[PDB]
């Protein structure tokens, strides 16, 4: 039993809700919140900008130190950093950005990072400003993630389309 509330169950392990991931994280305080990161961990907009703003820029400060030490992530890769006031940990995952020409096949590799964590609160990778089709992203999620994933979808209209079209 966990504290996630109001989710629709899609599969054995995947759940979905119309919610603001920032507000969902603030209430649940999950072990892991997933950030829709880029390779530079520059949290300027989309989910990343919203999560970082909620941390009063502490996420960005921590991220800049991470990059200065380790260099950029790979597209399809991830790192675990602090969850600050939102979660115990933040898993920064880089899905391909279609608006930069990155290969969509890397979306499966990106979701594989979720399997290293038993339970996660996450957005749909490569959705929103990353330019992928969220219906495709949901399909890859369901077919790749085996751990328990609670997906927050900010836009009510998209949430309803994702549910109604789910196979
Ligand atoms: O429905 S979409 O097209 C948009 C969604 C991807 N982004 C998000 N996903 C879940 N929670 C979110 N909270 C936010 C707050 C913000 F300021 C900006 C973005 C998000 C966001 C696929």
From Swiss-Prot:
It catalyses: Thiol-dependent hydrolysis of ester, thioester, amide, peptide and isopeptide bonds formed by the C-terminal Gly of ubiquitin (a 76-residue protein attached to proteins as an intracellular targeting signal). Inhibited in vitro by GRL-0617. Residues 1-167 form the Macro domain. It is found in: Host endoplasmic reticulum membrane. Coiled coil: none annotated. It is a multi-pass membrane protein. Responsible for the cleavages located at the N-terminus of the replicase polyprotein. Participates together with nsp4 in the assembly of virally-induced cytoplasmic double-membrane vesicles necessary for viral replication. Antagonizes innate immune induction of type I interferon by blocking the phosphorylation, dimerization and subsequent nuclear translocation of host IRF3. Also prevents host NF-kappa-B signaling. In addition, PL-PRO possesses a deubiquitinating/deISGylating activity and processes both 'Lys-48'- and 'Lys-63'-linked polyubiquitin chains from cellular substrates. May form homohexamers. Interacts with N protein. This is Papain-like protease nsp3. It comes from Severe acute respiratory syndrome coronavirus 2 (2019-nCoV). The lineage of its organism: Viruses, Riboviria, Orthornavirae, Pisuviricota, Pisoniviricetes.
């Amino acid at each position: 039993v966990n504290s996630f509330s109001g989710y629709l169950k899609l599969t054995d392990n995947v759940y979905i809700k119309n919610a603001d991931i920032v507000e969902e994280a603030k209430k649940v305080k999950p072990t892991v919140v997933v950030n829709a990161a880029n390779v530079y961990l520059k949290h300027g907009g989309g989910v990343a900008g919203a999560l970082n703003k909620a941390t009063n820029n502490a996420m960005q400060v921590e991220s800049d130190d991470y990059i200065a030490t380790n260099g950029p992530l790979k597209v399809g890769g991830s790192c675990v950093l602090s969850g600050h006031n939102l979660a115990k940990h933040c898993l920064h995952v880089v899905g391909p950005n279609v608006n930069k020409g990155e290969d969509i096949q890397l979306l499966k590799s990106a979701y594989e990072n979720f399997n290293q964590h038993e339970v996660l609160l996450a957005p749909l990778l490569s959705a929103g400003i990353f330019g992928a089709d969220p219906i495709h992203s949901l399909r890859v999620c369901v077919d790749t993630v085996r751990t328990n994933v609670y997906l927050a979808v900010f836009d009510k209209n998209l949430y309803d389309k994702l549910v109604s079209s789910f196979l």
